[PDB]
Ligand binder design. Structure first.
Ligand SMILES: [Cl-]
Length: 554
C-alpha cells in the first residue's frame, strides 16, 4: 500500500553550526576518561536514518481491533473538552520554541505581540476555511548524545524531526491542548504511563504483578513506530478525538489539522528545498505523544485479545509498552507472544527485538528502564526504578561552547536518586564540581516532558525524600544485575570504579558537612552510604511542604 515517506534527493540540512568537540572537557574529565566514545548525532547521518524509516505499510485489521476501538470511542465520549483561546495557546508556547518564518518567535508569542497574534488569527481562519491543502513542514536531524556501541554498528544515525511553522503549532493547542490533557487518562485509566513518577511507576508494576496468581510480563519494542503509523491510524485518532463532546469550531479545526497536517504532507529542509513527502506520524506535532500512546494502546490490547493474553495489565508511554498478565505455562506463553507479535505486525506495528516472556520483574526493560531491588541494613526489600547508566554518563560528558552537562547531571540525580550509580557517581561528581565552583546555591534547570523547573541543589535532600522516600538514602545491598551493569558501564567509559567513588564521596561529604546549614544536610543525607557509622536520618519537614505532582505528569 503506502510508503511512510518519499524523497526528492535534496539533503536534510543543518540549521547553521554543528558543534565541534573541544580538546579539553573541563567539567567531566574527572568523571570519565574515554571522551572519544561520546558522540552527537548530526545531519551527516540523516540520509542513513531516512533509508531505515522509509518502507511500505500494509495493514489488516480484525474483529479484536474493531471491538477495542469501539470500547475506546465509548470511553472517549465521556470527555468534555474546550477550545483554548488564541491567547491561552500562545501562552503555552515553550520559551525557546523554534521561531516562525513570518518574523517572530516564542518571546513575541508568549508576550502576545500584535503581529504574532495577528498572523495566528489568519492561520486559524485558513484552517476553518480550507480543510484540504497540505500544510508544509520542516525536516531536521535531531542532535542527541550517545556512547559508541561496537556490538550495534558503532554510531546511531540522527532521529528525524518534522514540524509545521510556529503559527500552526499555536493553532494545534487551541484545537487540541485540552484533549491532550484529558483523553489519554480517559481512554486508558491507570494504563497511561505519563502520569507516574519513577516510584509510582514501580508501585504500579508491583501491584500488577502481585495481582496475578502466576504472573508473566513482557515488553514490546516497535521498530520505528512513527514510520509505522498509517493515514488510517491517524484518521482513526481524529475519530477518537471527535468522540468527545467538543464545540463545533474545534471539530472543524481538528478535522482540518488531521487532513492537512497529521495524515501527511510535504517536507522542506532548512535551506528551503523540497525534501520529500510524509505519509506517517510527524515527530514534532502536538498529538504525537497522545497519538502514539492511544494507537499503541489500541493495537496492543487487540493483539492481546488475538493472542489470548489472560488478564492483561498494561503500561503505555507513546511507543513503549509493558504487559503483565496471567501466565498460561511457559510453552503456551511463548506461543501467545509469537501470536501477539503477528497481530501487531498485521496492525502495522512490527517489532525490533522480538518480545519474550519473563517471570522476574527485574528482566523487563521498558522506556529504557527497569525495576530492581535493594535491601535496607536490616534486610527489608525496597524496589526502585533504574536503567543502564551508559547514556546518562555519555550525556554527563557532553561539553561544548554552547552546552553544559550540569542540567543533565541534575535530571538523572532527580529521576534516579535511589540507584547505586546516581548515589556513588553522579551525586559525588555533581557536588564536588559545584563546591569548587562555589555555585552550590545557584539554581539549575530540571528538564522533563518539554517542561523546566528551577531547582536549588541544596534542596535535593527534600526533593528526593518527597519523590522517592527516605529509603533513597539507605539502600544497602544492590542486585547482582545492577552491580554488574554499573561496573561494566564505568569500565566502558573510562570512569573510576565504584571503590574510588566511595573515597571521593567521603571527601565530598566532609566538605559539605563543614560548610554547615543546608550543604551540611546534603552531606548527611545524600552521602550517608559512604561512612561505616551511619547517622539516623529523619523525615525532613521541608519535604512535607513540597508539591512535585506536575513534574512527572504530562
Ligand atoms: Cl546548556
Amino acid at each position: 500500500s503506502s510508503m511512510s515517506y518519499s524523497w526528492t534527493g535534496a539533503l536534510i540540512t543543518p540549521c547553521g553550526p554543528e558543534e565541534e568537540k573541544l580538546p579539553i572537557n573541563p567539567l567531566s574529565n574527572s568523571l570519565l576518561r574515554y571522551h572519544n566514545k561520546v558522540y552527537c548525532t548530526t545531519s551527516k547521518s540523516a540520509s542513513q536514518r531516512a533509508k531505515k524509516v522509509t518502507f511500505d505499510r500494509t495493514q489488516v485489521l480484525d474483529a479484536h481491533y474493531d471491538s477495542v476501538l469501539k470500547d475506546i470511542k465509548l470511553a472517549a465520549s465521556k470527555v468534555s473538552a474546550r477550545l483554548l483561546t488564541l491567547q491561552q495557546a500562545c501562552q503555552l508556547t515553550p520559551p525557546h520554541s523554534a521561531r516562525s518564518k513570518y518574523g517572530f518567535g516564542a518571546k513575541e508569542v508568549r508576550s502576545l505581540s500584535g503581529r504574532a497574534v495577528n498572523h495566528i488569527k489568519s492561520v486559524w481562519k485558513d484552517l476553518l476555511e480550507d480543510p484540504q491543502t497540505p500544510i508544509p513542514t520542516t525536516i531536521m536531524a535531531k542532535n542527541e548524545v550517545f556512547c559508541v556501541d561496537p556490538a550495534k554498528g558503532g554510531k546511531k544515525p540522527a532521529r528525524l524531526i518534522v514540524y509545521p511553522d510556529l503559527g500552526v503549532r499555536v493553532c494545534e493547542k487551541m484545537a487540541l491542548y485540552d484533549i491532550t490533557q484529558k483523553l489519554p487518562q480517559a481512554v486508558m485509566g491507570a494504563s497511561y504511563g505519563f502520569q507516574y513518577s519513577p516510584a509510582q511507576r514501580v508501585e504500579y508494576l508491583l501491584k500488577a504483578w502481585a495481582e496475578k496468581k502466576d504472573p508473566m510480563g513482557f515488553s514490546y519494542d516497535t521498530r520505528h513506530f512513527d514510520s509505522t503509523v498509517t493515514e488510517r491510524d491517524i484518521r482513526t485518532e481524529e475519530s477518537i478525538y471527535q468522540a468527545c463532546s467538543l464545540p463545533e469550531e474545534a471539530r472543524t479545526a481538528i478535522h482540518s489539522l488531521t487532513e492537512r497536517l497529521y495524515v501527511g504532507g510535504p517536507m522542506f529542509n532548512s535551506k528551503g528545498q523540497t525534501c520529500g513527502y510524509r505519509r506517517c506520524r510527524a515527530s514534532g506535532v502536538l498529538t504525537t505523544s497522545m497519538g502514539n500512546t492511544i494507537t499503541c494502546y489500541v493495537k496492543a490490547l487487540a493483539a492481546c485479545k488475538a493472542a489470548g493474553i489472560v488478564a492483561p495489565t498494561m503500561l503505555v508511554c507513546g511507543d513503549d509498552l509493558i504487559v503483565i498478565s496471567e501466565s498460561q505455562g511457559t510453552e503456551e506463553d511463548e506461543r501467545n507472544l509469537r501470536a501477539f507479535t503477528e497481530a501487531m505486525t498485521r496492525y502495522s506495528a512490527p517489532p525490533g527485538d522480538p518480545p519474550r516472556p519473563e517471570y522476574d520483574l527485574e528482566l523487563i526493560t521498558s522506556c529504557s528502564s527497569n525495576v530492581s531491588v535493594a535491601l535496607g541494613p536490616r534486610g527489608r526489600r525496597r524496589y526502585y526504578l533504574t536503567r543502564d547508566p551508559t547514556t546518562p554518563l555519555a550525556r554527563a560528558a557532553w561539553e561544548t561552547v554552547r552546552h553544559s552537562p550540569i542540567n543533565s547531571w541534575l535530571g538523572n540525580i532527580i529521576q534516579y536518586a535511589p540507584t547505586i550509580w546516581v548515589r556513588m557517581v553522579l551525586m559525588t561528581h555533581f557536588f564536588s564540581i559545584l563546591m569548587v565552583q562555589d555555585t552550590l546555591d545557584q539554581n539549575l534547570n530540571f528538564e522533563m516532558y518539554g517542561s523546566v523547573y528551577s531547582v536549588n541543589p541544596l534542596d535535593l535532600p527534600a526533593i528526593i525524600e518527597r519523590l522517592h522516600g527516605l529509603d533513597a538514602f539507605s539502600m544497602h545491598t544492590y542486585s547482582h544485575h545492577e552491580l554488574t551493569r554499573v561496573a561494566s558501564a564505568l569500565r566502558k567509559l573510562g570512569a573510576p570504579p565504584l571503590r574510588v567513588w566511595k573515597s571521593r564521596a567521603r571527601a565530598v561529604r566532609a566538605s559539605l558537612i563543614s560548610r554547615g546549614g543546608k550543604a551540611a544536610v546534603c552531606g548527611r543525607y545524600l552521602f550517608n552510604w559512604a561512612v561505616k557509622t551511619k547517622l539516623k536520618l529523619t523525615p525532613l519537614p521541608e519535604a512535607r511542604l513540597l508539591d512535585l505532582s506536575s513534574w512527572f505528569t504530562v
